Write a protein that binds this ligand. Structure first.
Ligand SMILES: *[C@H]1O[C@H](CO)[C@H](O)[C@H](O)[C@H]1NC(C)=O
Length: 7
């Protein structure tokens, strides 16, 4: 878990 708000 090392993702971020994809926008
Ligand atoms: C990052 O986003 C991804 C999208 O699938 C997952 O939700 C993941 O759990 C996220 N990581 C954190 C640290 O929130």
């Amino acid at each position: 878990p090392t993702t971020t708000p994809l926008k």
